[model samples]
Target: FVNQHLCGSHLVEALYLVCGERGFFYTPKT
Candidate 1:
């Protein structure tokens, strides 16, 4: 489960980066 969680984190980070490159800004609420 730890490994799967890490993979998911990486995927989400990558997706955020891609979106940022395309001018899609994502701001998560604190």
Candidate 2:
């Protein structure tokens, strides 16, 4: 299950989780 994003499942599933928790990445935003 892959979703459309800048990075990949590695980031979206793992990195994204940490980034979001740490306030690092704001992908889906205005």
Candidate 3:
């Protein structure tokens, strides 16, 4: 759905940053 609304690369990068190897490092509400 993200890619459908935004660019593919942007969706992929965002997904990766939130759910990939380095995912755990990010915090949406810290």
Candidate 4:
């Protein structure tokens, strides 16, 4: 949904950092 609603790498990077920092379980949708 990220690619569907959002545009640009900033959001991606931000999400990655947030998820990583919080230890949130996230797996890329294939």
Candidate 5:
């Protein structure tokens, strides 16, 4: 697991972005 930021509208998409290479580390705002 990792300390990923909020997904916001991107939701799971954001995670999927980083999940491919590095990991879940997106910093989104509401």
Candidate 6:
């Protein structure tokens, strides 16, 4: 599992786990 603070690092990790390196990223625009 990925903590909310470590999201950036986990994003790449998630891509690797899911294969195809495909994923969507979300952040508050402020």
**How accurate locally is residue 26 in candidate 4, as Cα lDDT from 0 to 100?**
41
| Model 1 pairs whose backbones collide | none
Give the per-residue lDDT of model 4 (tens digit) for 1-30. 344444466557767776786765444567
Better of 4 and 5 by TM-score: 4
Better of 3 and 6 by TM-score: 3
Tens-place lDDT per residue, model 1, 1-30, is 133443545766855766775755445557
lDDT of 3 by residue, 1-30 (tens): 344453646666666766876554333444
Collision count for each candidate, in order: 0, 0, 0, 0, 0, 0
Ranking by TM-score: 4, 1, 3, 6, 5, 2
Candidate 5 ranges with C-alpha deviation above 4 Å: 1-9, 21-30
Clashing pairs in 5: none
Error of 2 at 10 (Å): 3.7
Evaluated against the true structure, the overall lDDT of model 6 is: 0.57
Worst 10 residues of 5 by lDDT: 21-30
At residue 26, what lDDT does model 5 achieve? 53
lDDT of 4: 0.60
lDDT of 5 by residue, 1-30 (tens): 676666455666856865777667655456
lDDT per model vs. reference: 0.57, 0.59, 0.56, 0.60, 0.64, 0.57
RMSD, one per candidate, in order: 6.4, 7.2, 8.0, 5.5, 8.1, 4.3
TM-score of each candidate structure, all chains considered together: 0.40, 0.26, 0.39, 0.41, 0.31, 0.37
Please identify model 3 stretches exceeding 4 Å from their true place.
1-5, 22-30
Report the C-alpha lDDT of model 2 over 1-30, residue by residue, as the tens digit: 576455555556766665675756537645
- Of the candidates shown, which would achieve the greatest TM-score relative to the real structure? 4
- Pairs of colliding residues, candidate 4: none
Q: Which candidate wins on lDDT?
A: 5
When summed lDDT is taken over every stretch of 10 residues in candidate 4, the lowest stretch is 1-10
The candidate 2 region of ten consecutive residues with least summed lDDT is: 1-10
